[PDB]
Amino acid sequence: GSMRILMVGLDAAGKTTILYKLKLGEIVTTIPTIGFNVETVEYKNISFTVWDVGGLDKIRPLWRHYFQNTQGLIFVVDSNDRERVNEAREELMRMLAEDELRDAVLLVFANKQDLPNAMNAAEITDKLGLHSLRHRNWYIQATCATSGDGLYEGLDWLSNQLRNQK
Ligand SMILES: Nc1nc2c(ncn2[C@@H]2O[C@H](COP(=O)(O)OP(=O)(O)OP(=O)(O)O)[C@@H](O)[C@H]2O)c(=O)[nH]1
Ligand SMILES: [Mg+2]
Questions:
Q1: How far away, in angstroms, is 34 Cα from ligand 2 center?
Q2: Residue 16 alpha carbon to ligand 1 centre in Å
Q3: Which atom of ligand 1 is found nearest the CA of 113?
Q4: Record-annotated residues binding GTP?
């Protein structure tokens, strides 16, 4: 068995970029993902099956098909997209309301930190209302997917949540 991780977030957030940076160590050219991409990533001797599911609004209903048995959620946010940060919050809270996910741990990637007007992790925390969450293991990590910055730190937390020993 591997650890089942669902990676979701609005379209353009950087999910597919993150998946292939994590898996392949390269920055891949993408198009908006119509279905899903999937790879198993090994980190510190723990294997994570990461489901990168398309975030275009039209296909957001399909996220629910991936909730079952999910152990960890990676919610990717475009930290430069102030106009849509409340929409990101709404989608996150709609997902967190699901009983199926009540035990899932939540890693938020505050992505695109390379952009000069990016909101930082503290700001994104406020905008997503993370501090109000109850009975939820959660962590927010500032990242730049293209440079790799912050990714392994996110994985450190996620691996620690899901593993029970060295
Ligand atoms: N500046 C900047 N751009 C990024 C970063 N991460 C991803 N991108 C760019 O953002 C755009 C969208 O990235 P994707 O990975 O396709 O986004 P997605 O979340 O998979 O989008 P959907 O497939 O629609 O769900 C691409 O042009 C990426 O190169 C980042 O850290 N900084
Ligand atoms: Mg994609």
A1: 8
A2: 7
A3: 31
A4: 9-17, 111-114, 145
Matching residue, tokens 């899901």: 162
User: Could you tell me the two tokens for 105?
Assistant: 């741990």
Mutate to test the pocket of ligand 1, among 10, 17, 76 (most ligand atoms within 8 A of CB): 17
In the three-class reduction of DSSP (H, G, I as helix; E, B as strand; rest coil), residue 16 is classed as helix
| Annotated resolution, angstroms | 1.5
Give the span between the Cα atoms of 38 and 26, in whole angstroms.
16
Ordered structural domains, the chain, with CATH: 1-166 (3.40.50.300)
Q: What contacts 59, CB < 8 A, 6 or more positions away?
A: 34, 35
Report the C-alpha gap between 52 and 102 in whole angstroms: 20
Q: Which residues pair with 5 in a beta bridge?
A: 50, 72
- Enumerate the β-bridge partners of residue 108: 75, 140
**Rounded Cα gap, residues 150 and 109, in angstroms:** 9
